[PDB]
């Protein structure tokens, strides 16, 4: 393609965790640079990542304006060092991304067990309610703030002295479980949005033990 002045991007991919949302694509800049646009399905197109050699574009600040909207992005190619040479109609070559709905598709980050507290045969296990990239006024909202009742946590726990695994689930960030006295237990959790069809679960948290 030594007679073409640009080639269209491809393999456009949404990388999104806790609403930090970056579009990635191919190819590495080869005699060309890129600009991205993003819109909601019925909204205006906004340009981002102007005339960049990057093969990524952070779109977090746009998608957190309404995490329940469905966003479309596209990546334009421009001849390097000659970025206004976009053909007779003013339309550079581009490719379209998949649609992306942040609320339904952003990955849940790996959780952290904040604490556990035992009194006799009962233990509280508390999960950290960590921050997302969604802003409200001047503040970052937590996972619970964003998802409300749609978010649950699951606990995987075991006694070191036994081969079985036990599970529990909570609608909050806290579990109250029964344990045998004199046994050391270990714990891991996962964040889950049961109503999702894809990316329903986070990875397991680090393991914490009595």
């Amino acid at each position: 393609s030594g007679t073409t002045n640009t080639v269209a991007a491809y393999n456009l991919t949404w990388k999104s965790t806790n609403f930090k949302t970056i579009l990635e694509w191919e190819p590495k800049p080869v005699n060309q640079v890129y600009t991205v646009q993003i819109s909601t399905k019925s909204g205006d197109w906004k340009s981002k990542c102007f005339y960049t050699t990057d093969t990524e574009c952070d779109l977090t600040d746009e998608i957190v304006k309404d995490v329940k909207q469905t966003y479309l992005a596209r990546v334009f190619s421009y001849p390097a060092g000659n970025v206004e040479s976009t053909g007779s109609a003013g339309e550079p070559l581009y490719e379209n991304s998949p649609e992306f709905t942040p609320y339904l598709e952003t990955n849940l980050g790996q959780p952290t067990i904040q604490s556990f507290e035992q009194v006799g045969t009962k233990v509280n296990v508390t999960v950290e309610d960590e921050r997302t990239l969604v802003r409200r006024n001047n503040t970052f909202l937590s996972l619970r703030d964003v998802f409300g009742k749609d978010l649950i946590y699951t606990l995987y726990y075991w006694k070191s002295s036994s081969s079985g695994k036990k599970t529990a689930k909570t609608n909050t960030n806290e579990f109250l479980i029964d344990v045998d006295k004199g046994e050391n237990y270990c714990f891991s959790v996962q964040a889950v949005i049961p109503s999702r069809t894809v990316n329903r679960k986070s990875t397991d948290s680090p393991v914490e033990c009595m």
Partner: protein, 143 residues
């Protein structure tokens, strides 16, 4: 970690993996079960990808599995908070902030301009009519 004679002692997660760095084998001696050990190890051995301080411009780094996330201050964006929101004041970026027309210039800030029948305000970006019926306004609604 292993020092002479320590391994005569029962394993201890606190002593060996929290107060010290433990190898896979040392963790294995604590948890016994292969799958339990792996579940511990995938996080314990991952490393802190924030250790390289990847978040710029006063951002805050949150470690993940084999990755991190940067929380940026309000004027910044980017994977690493490397982008300042008003660092490409060019006509293709939201019209340069101009209400009507925009021109990029070599070696000067962009300028905003207005259509015939309008004049540019002191703010350097906004336009106001200089005639009774300027183009592109709907007088029956703006009365």
């Amino acid at each position: 970690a292993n020092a002479f004679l320590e391994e005569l002692r029962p394993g201890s997660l606190e002593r060996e993996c929290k107060e010290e760095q433990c190898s896979f084998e040392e963790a294995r001696e604590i948890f016994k079960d292969a799958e339990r050990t792996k579940l511990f190890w995938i996080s314990y051995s991952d490393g802190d990808q924030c250790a390289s301080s990847p978040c710029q411009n006063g951002g805050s780094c949150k470690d993940q599995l084999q990755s991190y996330i940067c929380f940026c201050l309000p004027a910044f964006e980017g994977r690493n908070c490397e982008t300042h929101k008003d660092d490409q004041l060019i006509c293709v970026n939201e019209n340069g902030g101009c209400e009507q027309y925009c021109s990029d210039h070599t070696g000067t800030k962009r300028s905003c301009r207005c259509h015939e029948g309008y004049s540019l305000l002191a703010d350097g970006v906004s336009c106001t009519p200089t005639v009774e019926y300027p183009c592109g306004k709907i007088p029956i609604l703006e009365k």
